[PDB]
């Protein structure tokens, strides 16, 4: 197995997920117009958040420790049992919070209390989201790129079918339910694929508790908590700087660039958690880690650069196809943003190493470094160049950050503190 082959499997599943999302999104737009989209905005962002929140964000830790103990049946059972207990316990608590406070949640999502029933349904749907994401994370712990990809492919296709029946039956609220069911229905193929492929015995998923492993998986919850604040906060007051001196139109130009660039990054690095994270988890010697990091960088940097150059060449086609023709001025932002994306992908290689070593301390330092650099550059370039400055700030940020990642890796590899 290799990063390239894992990328081939993961690209196929990600492309189907993108095609399914574009299909469902256009069905929702044609069916319910801007009023339906504006009312679905918060609810859809909640569905995204639940993809990590429903299982308490331990998924990367599940992958990390399954990889570490993939040849240790006793510890592996403890790992999967504790992970099952943590996902079951948290998802159950989440379901109770949702059903008990369905009225305040509906008010915060839609502006009135008319969606309590949908919120109570989501309380059960997020269990499928949490459990499905756990099974995928287990497969990734075994570096099963094919099982992961086949599961997501079946789930996307059945998700589109479920969305069609759901909105045809129940109108707008049925459509929203289908949106929540898109990431939840993966649990059906994921469970089938995991058992059928002989990855682990089914009994491993029985909830158990191990205090040590629970504390270790909690480190990945804490990284998920930190990540959901720092850079999101950064982009929020980046938009603040933008609006302070420019129009909302320019703000929309930048937000459109950022959101499509983030989706581009998620598609491009999706195989990192499938291959890179479990592989680096198993390696402990500095020579072996360096070899894998160098080999990964030698593959991903030219591949992402070639892909991003192609995207920039077709930026007008990418805008006309992927986004609503209401700006068409974001083309000038593509170059800077795409360069920053190439270096950010390179910086992800070091970032997944930190994940693979469960280093909460280096995770904090990586996040604060990215936040502060983004802030120094945004505070400099945004007031002078608007959305173009925001793209320049993002690019300059990850030029410096990737260089910093290299330097810190060299100091760590040579054991500068010892």
């Amino acid at each position: 197995v290799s990063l390239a082959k894992a990328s081939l499997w993961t690209a196929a599943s990600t492309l189907v997920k993108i095609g399914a999302g574009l299909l469902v999104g256009k069905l929702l737009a044609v069916s319910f117009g801007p009023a339906g989209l504006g009312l679905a905005a918060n609810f859809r962002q909640l569905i995204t958040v639940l993809g990590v929140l429903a299982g308490a964000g331990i998924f990367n830790g599940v992958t990390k420790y399954v990889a570490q103990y993939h040849d240790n049946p006793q510890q592996l059972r403890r790992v999967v049992g504790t992970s099952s207990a943590m996902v079951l316990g948290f998802s159950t608590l989440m379901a109770l919070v949702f059903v008990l406070a369905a009225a305040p949640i509906s008010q915060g999502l839609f502006g009135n209390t008319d969606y309590q029933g949908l919120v109570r349904l989501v309380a059960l749907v997020q269990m499928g989201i949490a459990w499905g994401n756990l099974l995928l994370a287990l497969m990734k712990g075994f570096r099963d790129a094919a099982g992961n990809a086949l599961s997501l492919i079946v789930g996307s296709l059945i998700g589109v079918l479920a969305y069609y029946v759901s909105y045809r039956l129940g109108g707008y609220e049925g459509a929203l339910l289908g949106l929540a069911l898109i990431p939840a229905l993966v649990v059906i193929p994921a469970a089938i694929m995991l058992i059928k492929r002989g990855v682990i015995p089914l009994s491993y998923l029985k909830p158990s508790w191990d205090n040590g492993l629970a504390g270790q998986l909690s480190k990945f919850t804490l990284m998920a908590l930190i990540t959901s604040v720092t850079l999101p906060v950064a982009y929020i007051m980046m938009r603040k700087l933008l609006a302070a001196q420019y129009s909302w139109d320019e703000v929309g130009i930048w937000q459109g660039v950022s959101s499509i660039s983030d989706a581009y990054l998620q598609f491009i690095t999706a195989s990192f958690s499938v291959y890179l994270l479990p592989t680096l988890s198993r390696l402990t010697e500095k020579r072996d880690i360096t070899r894998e990091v160098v080999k990964s960088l030698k593959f991903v940097l030219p591949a992402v650069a070639a892909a991003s150059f192609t995207v920039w060449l077709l930026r007008d086609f990418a805008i006309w196809l992927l986004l609503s023709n209401k700006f068409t001025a974001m083309r000038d932002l593509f170059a800077w943003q795409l360069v920053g994306d190439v270096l950010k992908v390179g910086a992800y290689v070091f970032g997944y190493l930190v994940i693979a070593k469960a280093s909460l301390r280096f995770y904090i330092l990586a996040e604060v470094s990215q936040f502060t650099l983004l802030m120094v550059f945004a505070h400099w370039l945004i007031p002078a160049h608007g959305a173009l400055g925001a793209a320049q700030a993002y690019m300059a940020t990850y030029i410096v950050y990737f260089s910093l990642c290299c330097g810190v890796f060299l100091l760590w590899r040579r054991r500068a503190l010892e």
Partner: nanobody
Amino acid sequence: QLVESGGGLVQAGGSLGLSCAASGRTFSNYVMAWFRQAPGKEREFVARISESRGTTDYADSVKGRFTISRDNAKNTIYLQMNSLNPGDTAVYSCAATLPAWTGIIGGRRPGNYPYWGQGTQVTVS
């Protein structure tokens, strides 16, 4: 987009007529509905008239007692309420939405109607 008229303090057993006017242009394509919300509960479905064949739907608590109708000439809808019992005391609101928002069986869900009126009070002594 929607304004309500009628209602108030009415003696139990007496009749009452609510009416709702709509602005805009395209009105014959909007499904029209009445909802009510009593003090302490949530918005519940009352009655609904379609945009096409003039079909009607009623909650089981108001069937036979309440009758919804519409007039596409003046873009208004009405709710006749006979045999008013104390359980009918609530704020009544008219709602408008397109048939794609209701689907096949979602016509009773208030979240499928994005356009609402201010609500008129009905108190059955």
